[PDB]
Amino acid sequence: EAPAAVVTGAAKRIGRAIAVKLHQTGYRVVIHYHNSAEAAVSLADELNKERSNTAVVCQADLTNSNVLPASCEEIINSCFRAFGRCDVLVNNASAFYPTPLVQGKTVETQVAELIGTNAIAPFLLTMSFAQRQSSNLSIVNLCDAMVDQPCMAFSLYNMGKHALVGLTQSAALELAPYGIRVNGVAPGVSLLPVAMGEEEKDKWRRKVPLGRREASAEQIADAVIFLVSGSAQYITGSIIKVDGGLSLVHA
Amino acid sequence: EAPAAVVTGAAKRIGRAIAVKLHQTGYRVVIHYHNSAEAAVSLADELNKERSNTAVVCQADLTNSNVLPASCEEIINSCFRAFGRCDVLVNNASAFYPTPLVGKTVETQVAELIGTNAIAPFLLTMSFAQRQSSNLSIVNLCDAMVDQPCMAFSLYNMGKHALVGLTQSAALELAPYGIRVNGVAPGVSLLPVAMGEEEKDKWRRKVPLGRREASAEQIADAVIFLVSGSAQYITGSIIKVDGGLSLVHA
Amino acid sequence: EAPAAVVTGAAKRIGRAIAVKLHQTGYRVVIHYHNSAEAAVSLADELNKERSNTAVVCQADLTNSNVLPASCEEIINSCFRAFGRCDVLVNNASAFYPTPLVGKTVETQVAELIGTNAIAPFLLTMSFAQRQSSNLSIVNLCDAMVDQPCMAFSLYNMGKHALVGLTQSAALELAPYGIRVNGVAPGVSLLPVAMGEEEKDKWRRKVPLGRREASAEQIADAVIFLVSGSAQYITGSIIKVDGGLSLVHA
Amino acid sequence: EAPAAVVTGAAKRIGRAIAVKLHQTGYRVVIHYHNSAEAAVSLADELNKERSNTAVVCQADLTNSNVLPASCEEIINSCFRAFGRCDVLVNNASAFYPTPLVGKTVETQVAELIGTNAIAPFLLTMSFAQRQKSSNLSIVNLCDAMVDQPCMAFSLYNMGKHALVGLTQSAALELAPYGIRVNGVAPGVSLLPVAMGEEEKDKWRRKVPLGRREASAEQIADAVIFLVSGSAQYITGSIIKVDGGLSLVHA
Lengths: 251, 250, 250, 251
Ligand SMILES: NC(=O)c1ccc[n+]([C@@H]2O[C@H](COP(=O)([O-])OP(=O)(O)OC[C@H]3O[C@@H](n4cnc5c(N)ncnc54)[C@H](OP(=O)(O)O)[C@@H]3O)[C@@H](O)[C@H]2O)c1
Ligand SMILES: NC(=O)c1ccc[n+]([C@@H]2O[C@H](COP(=O)([O-])OP(=O)(O)OC[C@H]3O[C@@H](n4cnc5c(N)ncnc54)[C@H](OP(=O)(O)O)[C@@H]3O)[C@@H](O)[C@H]2O)c1
Ligand SMILES: NC(=O)c1ccc[n+]([C@@H]2O[C@H](COP(=O)([O-])OP(=O)(O)OC[C@H]3O[C@@H](n4cnc5c(N)ncnc54)[C@H](OP(=O)(O)O)[C@@H]3O)[C@@H](O)[C@H]2O)c1
Ligand SMILES: NC(=O)c1ccc[n+]([C@@H]2O[C@H](COP(=O)([O-])OP(=O)(O)OC[C@H]3O[C@@H](n4cnc5c(N)ncnc54)[C@H](OP(=O)(O)O)[C@@H]3O)[C@@H](O)[C@H]2O)c1
Ligand SMILES: Cc1ccc(-c2c[nH]c3nc(N)[nH]c(=O)c23)cc1
Ligand SMILES: Cc1ccc(-c2c[nH]c3nc(N)[nH]c(=O)c23)cc1
Ligand SMILES: Cc1ccc(-c2c[nH]c3nc(N)[nH]c(=O)c23)cc1
Ligand SMILES: Cc1ccc(-c2c[nH]c3nc(N)[nH]c(=O)c23)cc1
Fold this sequence. Notes:
Chains B, C: Keywords: Nucleotide-binding, Oxidoreductase. Chains B, C: It comes from Trypanosoma brucei brucei. Chains B, C: GO terms for molecular function: nucleotide binding; pteridine reductase activity. Chains B, C: Belongs to the short-chain dehydrogenases/reductases (SDR) family. Four copies of one chain form a homotetramer. The first copy, chain A, has about 250 residues and is α/β, with parallel strands linked by helices. Chain A has one domain: NAD(P)-binding Rossmann-like Domain (Rossmann fold), CATH 3.40.50.720. In chain A, about 45% of the residues lie in helices and about 15% in strands. Chain A is built from seven helices and seven strands. Chain A has helices spanning about 15-25, 35-50, 70-85, 105-130, 155-175, 200-205, 215-230, and strands at about 5, 30-35, 55-60, 90, 140, 180-185, 240. Chain A has a seven-stranded parallel beta sheet with strand order 3-2-1-4-5-6-7, with helices on both faces. In chain A, helix 1 (about 15-25) crosses helix 7, helix 3 (about 70-85) packs across helix 4 and helix 4 runs parallel beside helix 5 (about 155-175). The termini of chain A are far apart. Chains in contact: A-B, A-C, A-D, B-C, B-D, C-D. The interface of B and D includes residues 214 and 225 of B. Bound molecules: NADP nicotinamide-adenine-dinucleotide phosphate (4 copies) and 2-amino-5-(p-tolyl)-3H-pyrrolo[2,3-d]pyrimidin-4(7H)-one (4 copies). The site of one 2-amino-5-(p-tolyl)-3H-pyrrolo[2,3-d]pyrimidin-4(7H)-one has 7 residues of chain A, from loops.
């Protein structure tokens, strides 16, 4: 019987690439999304056309609130409801925007969205994943290769991603006895933002030593599939940079 | 006249030591506290008896919530209302207890542990910076053991990791204003009052330098250095004060 | 036609498993060795029996000395002599023993520990680069415990740190030629051959993931990944393969 | 009576500032140098004119060789010969130049860059510890804040400074039971090379978040003085960046 994976924010871009590559490898998938309903359903349609009854969608806001634990518990539940098991969790969903320290959304909302999606939701999903559990169980957290050389005015986002590194490490430690491995993949510049202009995209491209280009979504996904695979059976607590050398380059 | 500092969680233990040492250096201080009202007020008395009009208290819960931004703004304000300036911020207040992955609801655990260790420091940093030769700086109390965390302390460790990110991000962003941002990372210091000596001693034996915990004063020494004129080029730095504990393999 | 790889210290244990998996994946291999001539020869014989003339041996001392650059150049030359190309370099050979601060001379200890773990990797990297659809890469066998080192292993640990520096510096510098440079960092793998099981168990008990040492094959799996087409954007990265060992506090 | 310190490469620049501040603090000092004899002697004259019999010079090449252990032992011995004790060792001397991967031989590059930056510090540390067989004994290694974002084509120099981090950690661990603390100070840009032109200096200056300028030698020295002081008695294995935020800056 085929294993199953939850991928958060899987409707587009890197999350979709991850869900697609897991599915190609044999997995049944829960494609979680927040606002991108059409794209999520369109992906599940494609995957199910390849293998019937192997993809479902699951909608949730991963902003921090007092109900976030329930929402995270329900995402995991949806995987057991559809597929009878949950082998893999990939924490990919993420809010990303500037939050300058010195002077739209209130700061309360900024905290809730940036820390919720990048850190607290991954924590709650990890709790729920673990509580529901031979086989090959693991979690992969999408981290950021540039956490120690952050973008200017992205403190909350950066705090969130640092917290995600602590979760990766703390959860690797605590869940090791249950056979659940916990690891990360840390992109540098991969698929650039949709709203970014081509000139600014090129400025970022020229900073990458290996090939002067951004990582493809498939390149990020490749690292994810390695860590979930049997070829990574002794690996836990590890974060693999997939950044083409970007984090090595001084100002 | 004399510079002013806010120290969060300053009524006892390390925060008290820090407040006292800053006061001894010539600072006026805002003693923030949450539940330890008697100790805070008694500390303010002692400091004011030493030098008049150099200490006040400010109570606040630093648990994350929709009112935390206001609370943090008011802590910073209390320094300007009392002293007319705010030169140093020390983010010391911290919740610490296990939150296993398998009485408090989990959402309360999140709020307390991520609030006190990370979000409150961010919000105080915002308010500090907005309200601004001078020697302005922030010192965050981090943890030397963040990469080898205590078992079942996920949320606490996430909080201290986020604090490292804030230290770096704020160092970068506030550098144009001359505000330095740094950390001090204890290993074992003091030990919990509720811990029995037998368990205390197991920890002491782990420390290479002396087989003892740090005194609060030793932690405070590092904070004093970072706020001083002898650290004017230092920002984004985290100084371990751990007697080598983080270097010791399992 | 088939790509080719140099694996240093490939006659036994982890380096042997690396060479075997590389060969299994389709590479022709240079099995470098120092003392273990029978095992190296026997391995090349095994691999050549599988596929004709897909393995050769190359002996060299990788201790630092005035002849080390020439020896390293000749290792790379041996790959081109045998196979007409050199796609992959795996710096695996390593001396490992204590060098307390307080019957080899210290200058010999320096030469062996720093030479095998760092200088030879550098010299091999130079020679590999100078000699250059294409998937060119280097993988350095680092150490997950480099920041929590064994007591009295300062020169070894210095070597392994220098090897991290080389991994990063070379990733940057060689990126414009399409040569990727990465590492794999074991925690405990295999354990020493003569170590009593009761001592082995003390180490095993420390590993969170399964309370056991890694197999040689599990380390090799990571190397295969880094050399593969699935890692073609990965450079300057060091993958721990340690079962969580480096996360465990004292 | 007055404690004594050895500062390597102390005739000029940062090592000179260190020696001076140690002396202003009450230490007697061994001014080690290699080629800068006139400067070393001039500094010893200035210090002794301030307080007679409190400075000596000591010449040694710290290039790696089979006699490097003897040279390092003699440096420490010279402090004991002059002053009867050796309380502080500051490993400051350092060769620095490019060694690309693709007039000096490579064996000479290796010996100089790895010798000065790493092996000599190890040997000096050994000899310091062994001679210790009322006091605040410690070692301070001059590291580099940019070791993880290294200058292009500086691999041997970078390998040296990384080994120096490992030494700092390994020796802190091993020497702790003897009451000897071992720490580091990690500049980013300080002073700038004497060779460097005004335009190129300003280019580097502009990179620094805190003040858009290089650190003074005295600013580096301040941190060294802190680490040797009674205010750092629980600090060992710590490396303090003194870089004005430079290492936080992405490409
Ligand atoms: N792109 C890069 O260069 C890069 C660089 C460094 C790190 N990373 C990391 O790699 C991962 C993927 O990057 P990406 O660029 O593909 O991400 P992205 O497009 O920015 O975000 C992925 C998804 O996050 C979901 N999301 C955002 N806010 C949410 C909320 N409040 N609740 C629930 N879901 C929410 C969105 O779902 P809907 O669209 O369904 O609303 C979105 O599709 C992220 O974890 C990211 O931080 C990426
Ligand atoms: N002790 C150690 O060994 C050690 C080790 C590593 C890092 N550190 C760090 O060093 C710092 C000081 O350590 P410590 O042992 O002195 O701390 P602590 O005694 O655990 O706590 C310091 C203070 O934090 C305040 N606090 C807790 N929850 C709060 C809330 N919800 N809102 C506002 N304030 C709250 C408390 O104030 P009230 O008492 O007034 O309620 C408490 O006195 C902390 O940041 C800690 O994480 C300490
Ligand atoms: N095993 C572990 O738990 C562990 C942990 C952390 C890191 N690592 C790293 O993983 C790698 C492989 O580990 P391992 O345990 O398999 O290593 P090992 O058995 O200790 O050594 C590997 C080989 O290194 C070669 N070697 C030693 N001195 C040499 C010299 N002077 N010149 C040339 N070659 C020399 C030897 O070749 P001959 O036999 O032919 O003389 C030896 O078979 C090493 O880089 C190691 O540091 C291993
Ligand atoms: N300057 C910076 O921006 C910067 C940045 C990062 C790190 N650092 C570190 O801080 C320390 C001091 O920096 P710096 O710019 O002041 O250093 P420097 O001027 O480049 O070199 C310091 C001294 O090293 C000695 N030295 C060089 N080769 C030697 C050899 N073979 N044997 C013995 N001694 C030798 C020289 O002594 P003689 O003059 O007597 O020949 C020289 O005065 C160094 O460790 C450096 O790596 C500096
Ligand atoms: C140039 C450029 C633009 C964006 C990123 C980026 C980093 N982390 C992110 N997390 C989310 N969720 N989405 C993103 O787009 C990014 C990195 C470099
Ligand atoms: C044995 C032992 C006990 C406690 C600590 C400790 C770490 N971080 C902390 N943060 C707060 N706020 N309070 C604490 O007490 C601690 C570490 C080791
Ligand atoms: C108990 C125990 C024994 C050895 C190791 C070990 C670490 N690094 C090593 N490098 C080489 N070359 N050979 C080794 O054997 C080791 C780790 C733990
Ligand atoms: C622009 C610029 C120039 C030099 C440095 C520098 C780094 N590490 C060094 N070590 C020694 N010994 N001497 C140096 O001068 C430097 C850094 C930035």
